[PDB]
Design a protein around this ligand. Structure first.
Ligand SMILES: [Mg+2]
Ligand SMILES: [Zn+2]
Ligand SMILES: [Zn+2]
Ligand SMILES: [Zn+2]
Ligand SMILES: [Zn+2]
Ligand SMILES: [Zn+2]
Ligand SMILES: [Zn+2]
Lengths: 261, 49, 48, 182, 157
RNA sequence: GGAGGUCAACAUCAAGAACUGUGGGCCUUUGCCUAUAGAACUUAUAACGAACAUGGUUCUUGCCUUUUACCAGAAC
RNA sequence: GUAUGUAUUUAUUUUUAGAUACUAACAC
């Protein structure tokens, strides 16, 4: 309210500043139809985002609010949006109310207004499935922190918690020491989508620590959709949750069914 | 050309342009001819590329 | 809610039928009932 | 003919409160999100002036088989996700009625063409030892909140605030082990 | 007949020079409009176009005020302008009509192009859209006619 | 109301040397005979165009390893 | 002066002489 509701959204990036198209020289000559490169294959192309968002600093009201649009600006989620208050889509982190508005249409398509596909994706890629509600993000390529080795995993854990923590209401988080991955889980599908598009290709530590000014040379961290949990514990936990929720909606079924007669 | 006539097509009354200009997607103006030649060259070159 | 159904004029240049694409399909054969096949050697092989 | 003739299947929910609606019909639209075959597409807008636009995703066949709504993909009657209604039904009886679906391509491209009608369809600084949404929610209403940490593998972790934390000390402990962290 | 000074073109009438500077400020701006200032976003592109349309409108409005309001110029200067494409004959003619005095363009009144019915919301008085807005209390979602950049051609606003 | 428009839609443009409507009589509506009114555009060294291109099938050739691309005549 | 084919995973998913020889876009 005092933070977001009143203060109108502020342009993240001047339009002249936005990255050019035509990513650089992955190949010999440029190609006009598809936008890629021609012959040969340069070392695989991926790079950290020059940009990031600042939830309380940037986010503010926009035109969609008055126009009552449902869907959130992804260029905001990337903090790359150049339209500022003129933008057609909402700038702010998803809350429970707005998910309340989306609730009918969240089934087929993500919070950004993009249709979901059926099968996920070979590598668990960009957008999810409309078969399975998946609230759990896989965080990987933790070398987005670059090569700094840390006193403990509480560095990784703590830092990640403080990263995603802003983006939405977190149900749980587990970093794994052995294989480098975080698993982060939210209340709502919406926050999961939004956070995934927000934190993909990002860096870490402090606005200035050590190698900070070289951050832009890093690879950036994969945020992908996460598979199930093989251990028996959380599997019980899911089975139970599904049970009690099934039970919960049986109440609706018998209330409107009772109204049916 | 005198020996083998053709005797054209009634119902030909429909032309490409009369059908084309009808839609939202085409707009009409005047312009210098040489400029239309140059535009059409750039059009073509983009098409074949 | 009733409805009113309305065609949209295509941009003549763009492909009409955006989704018509040659693809091959194996259809199932759905057999609901069976058609009885209803008809009415020894030394013969030595001939045949 | 074959593709047009079956009329669309739309819920009453997503189709909105408007009395009369104008919807567009494109005779070859995108393929299904499911079968991957062409079909006829329908726009519409709930409101006349609503900015958002509704686009039927799946076929008529691929819908009818599953008995769902083309815009929603929720059950045609109960307004339920498909992966649920078959779980409720599966609760009655014992183990069955899961909808087995079509990997590869012409597995699915094949499958949509049979008239089966589907399995589902036929019936229709304080350290605290011994989720996070609940803790942050309860502690959120009684005072100032800054961060929480829990490691469910350790079943215990911090709760940090920016006096008000002592206001929390009224109800915090045993509700729960809560002390003042180092 | 053409904008160009081609030898066939008859020289300017009398009253021309006085208004030549005012017209040149328009021309020199249209040069800057079509220079191809690149933009990635759609919104920015059709904004660029909106510039051109609005400039054209302003010029023809200038001349229309000269001849049909102040009568500050001769008929012959006027007709010579129209024949030299400094003005839009058809557009002016719409301005002379009763209801259209402030009009955008000639696209905005096209009945055929628009999907159902006609005449951009660009033509509907704010007075009303505020009212149908009032029924919903959603305020009003309209800002710019996609063809033009208009907000309320309608001659009440 | 008059003049127009490098505006649109809908009609019509190759045939008993050829159109349409209407009145009357016979057969039993069609059709035949008789009476009457009006016929824009296109036609006699024949045709909407005082102009002149291409394609398909089928034959006959011509180049000539074969296919596209072709040679030059005909019919549809 | 060989079509053509196969593979190209980097970013960490929860518990002592030589004879018989084979072949060589290398020399009529
Ligand atoms: Mg051969
Ligand atoms: Zn934005
Ligand atoms: Zn389908
Ligand atoms: Zn629906
Ligand atoms: Zn306009
Ligand atoms: Zn308009
Ligand atoms: Zn306007």
């Amino acid at each position: 309210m005092t933070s977001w509701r009143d203060k109108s959204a502020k342009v993240q990036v001047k339009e002249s500043e936005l990255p050019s198209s035509i990513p650089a020289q992955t190949g010999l000559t440029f190609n006009i139809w598809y936008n890629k490169w021609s012959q040969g294959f340069a070392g695989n192309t991926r790079f950290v985002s020059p940009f990031a968002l600042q939830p309380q600093l940037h986010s503010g009201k926009t035109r969609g609010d008055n126009d009552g649009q449902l869907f959130f600006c992804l260029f905001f989620a990337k903090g790359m949006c150049c339209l500022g208050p003129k933008c057609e889509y909402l700038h702010h982190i998803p809350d429970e109310e707005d998910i309340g508005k989306l609730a009918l249409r969240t089934e087929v398509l993500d919070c950004f207004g993009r249709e979901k596909f059926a099968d996920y994706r070979e590598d668990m890629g960009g957008i999810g499935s409309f078969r399975k509600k998946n609230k759990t993000l896989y965080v990987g390529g933790i070398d987005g922190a670059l090569n700094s080795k840390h006193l403990k995993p509480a560095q990784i854990e703590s830092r990640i918690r403080f990263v995603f923590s802003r983006l939405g209401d977190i149900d749980r988080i587990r970093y794994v020491e052995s294989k480098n991955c975080g698993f982060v889980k939210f209340k709502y599908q919406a926050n999961a989508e939004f956070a995934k598009e927000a934190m993909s290709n990002q860096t870490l530590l402090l606005p200035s620590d050590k190698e900070w000014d070289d951050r832009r040379e890093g690879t950036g961290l994969l945020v992908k959709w996460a598979n199930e949990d093989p251990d028996p514990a959380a599997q019980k936990r899911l089975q139970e949750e599904l049970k009690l929720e099934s039970l919960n909606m049986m109440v609706h079924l018998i209330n409107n069914n009772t109204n049916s007669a | 050309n005198e020996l083998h006539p053709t005797l054209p097509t009634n119902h030909n009354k429909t032309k490409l342009l009369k059908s084309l200009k009808n839609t939202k997607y085409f707009q009409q103006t005047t312009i210098d001819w040489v400029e239309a030649g140059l535009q059409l060259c750039r059009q073509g070159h983009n098409m074949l590329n | 809610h009733h409805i009113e159904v309305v065609s949209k004029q295509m941009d003549p240049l763009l492909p009409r039928f955006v989704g018509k694409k040659a693809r091959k399909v194996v259809a199932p054969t759905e057999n609901d009932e069976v058609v009885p096949v209803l008809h009415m050697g020894e030394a013969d092989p030595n001939e045949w | 003919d074959e593709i047009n003739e079956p009329p669309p299947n739309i819920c009453e929910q997503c189709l909105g409160d408007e009395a009369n609606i104008r919807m567009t019909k494109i005779p070859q639209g995108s393929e299904c999100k499911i079968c991957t075959l062409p079909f006829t597409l329908y726009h519409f807008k709930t409101s006349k002036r609503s900015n958002n636009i509704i686009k039927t995703l799946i076929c008529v066949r691929c819908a009818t088989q599953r008995n769902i709504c083309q815009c929603c993909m929720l059950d045609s009657r109960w307004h339920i996700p498909i992966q649920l209604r078959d779980h409720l039904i599966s609760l009655v009886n014992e183990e069955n009625v899961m909808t087995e679906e079509a990997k590869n391509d012409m597995m699915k491209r094949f499958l949509s063409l049979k008239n089966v009608k589907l399995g589902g369809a036929q019936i229709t600084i304080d350290a605290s030892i011994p989720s996070q949404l609940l803790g942050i929610k309860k502690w959120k209403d009684g005072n100032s909140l800054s961060l929480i940490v829990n490691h469910k593998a350790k079943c215990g972790g911090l709760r940090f605030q920016s006096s008000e934390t002592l206001v929390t000390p009224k109800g915090l402990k045993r509700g729960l082990i809560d002390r003042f962290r180092i | 007949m053409p904008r160009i000074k081609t030898r066939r073109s008859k020289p300017a009438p009398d009253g021309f020079e006085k208004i030549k500077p005012t017209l040149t400020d328009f021309e020199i701006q249209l040069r800057d409009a079509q220079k191809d200032k690149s933009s990635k976003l759609a919104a920015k592109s059709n904004e660029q176009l909106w510039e051109i349309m609005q400039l054209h409108h302003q010029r023809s409005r200038y001349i229309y005020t000269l001849y049909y309001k102040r009568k500050a110029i001769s008929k012959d200067l006027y007709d010579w302008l129209i024949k030299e494409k400094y003005a839009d004959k058809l557009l002016i003619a719409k301005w002379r009509k009763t209801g259209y005095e402030k009009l955008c363009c000639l696209r905005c009144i096209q009945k055929n192009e628009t999907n159902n019915g006609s005449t951009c919301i660009c033509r509907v008085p704010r007075a009303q859209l505020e009212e149908e807005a009032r029924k919903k209390g959603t305020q009003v979602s309209f800002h710019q006619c996609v063809h033009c950049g208009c907000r309320g051609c309608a001659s009440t606003d």
